[PDB]
């Protein structure tokens, strides 16, 4: 509180959820309206998600940052929308005619099976991944590849070696998840942890003085954007998709910078 030197309720250095060693050991948690993805699970050169999804980094980067659409990310229920589209740069479908055809609220209950945009699409794709047939298909592709004997320049065999190395790395990554009790859909952050107050730089509060550091202001920014996002979602659902998708990107990039 300004000019009070008192911890404001439901803040960063608040009480009863953060607060003297119990205060140094207690932590907090923030719920996120939209899922986000770990910093070093994607952008880095070793892209475990890309190795598990058999798709180059370009499209997924697009789903996460830009607006691109998958044909059917989750394949567990019978689908009737034949799209066969890996990534759509623009939307050319009759989104107004198809949604208004069946019923209001009747389009929402089935749109998530085919039309999924954002980190939630990646989460749903990683969730229902059959880790026992992936290794089979990867091994049969490794056996088929390299046996035809098609020679050429260095760009040919170098690319073949890179492909088989990616395939072997995919097999090695998939064999672990079968016997490690670690589910692959945990790479996205549906909920973000909060660092304890004493671990953060905090000496004392006197006369409205705030010892917040850069990580503290990053946390303030991300919680501000998250509560604004959830307020926008709770206010009206018929708002434009552009502004809400831009804000979701904004929170995601913010939480990514915070994790980095």
């Amino acid at each position: 509180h300004y000019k009070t030197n008192k911890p404001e309720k439901d803040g960063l250095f608040c009480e009863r959820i953060f607060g003297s060693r119990i205060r140094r050991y207690q932590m907090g948690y923030i719920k996120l309206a939209c899922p986000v993805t770990h910093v070093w699970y994607l952008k880095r050169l070793p892209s475990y998600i890309a190795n598990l999804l058999d798709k180059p980094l370009k499209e997924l980067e697009g789903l996460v940052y830009c607006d691109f659409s998958f044909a059917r990310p989750i394949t567990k229920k019978p689908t009737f929308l034949r799209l066969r589209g890996l990534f759509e740069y623009e939307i050319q479908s009759w989104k107004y005619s198809i949604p208004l055809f069946f019923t209001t609220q009747g389009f929402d209950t089935f749109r998530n099976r085919e039309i999924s945009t954002g980190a939630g699409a990646i989460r749903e794709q990683l969730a229902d991944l059959d880790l026992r047939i992936i290794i089979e298909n990867s091994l049969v592709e490794w056996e088929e590849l390299g046996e035809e004997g098609h020679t050429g320049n260095e760009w040919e065999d170098r690319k073949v070696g890179r492909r088989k190395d990616f395939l072997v790395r995919r097999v090695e990554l998939a064999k672990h998840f079968i016997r490690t009790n670690i589910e692959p859909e945990w790479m996205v952050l549906c909920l973000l942890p909060v660092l304890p107050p004493e671990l953060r730089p905090i000496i004392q509060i006197d006369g409205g003085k705030l010892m917040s550091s850069d990580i503290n202001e990053l946390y303030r920014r991300v919680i501000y954007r998250n509560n604004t996002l959830t307020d926008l979602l709770t206010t009206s659902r018929s708002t434009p998709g552009e502004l809400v998708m831009c804000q979701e990107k904004l929170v995601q990039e913010a939480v990514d910078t915070l994790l980095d």
């Binding site: 070093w40 699970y41 880095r44 070793p46 475990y48 088989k164 190395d165 072997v168 790395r169 097999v171 090695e172 990554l173 672990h176 490690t180 009790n181 670690i182």
Partner: protein, 90 residues
Amino acid sequence: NVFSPGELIGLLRAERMGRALEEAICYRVVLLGITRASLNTQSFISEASFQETARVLAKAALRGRIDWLKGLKENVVLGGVIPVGTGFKG
């Protein structure tokens, strides 16, 4: 199903597997370096998390590695008694 095409296995383990298994196993001696050999160890706390500290933790958390505190700097970072000298029991 035993080993992958890209792996770094020990020399004695490779020789014993060759004497044991009949499946075609081909290995070539690789000369590691001062930095490269330290990045591939049986522990991730100290001997692996000293240079990168970013991917050595990522891959360890992805694999769910179980580290047995059989080193020195591991117990130094932990805070217990180092199993060297007076701490070495048995």
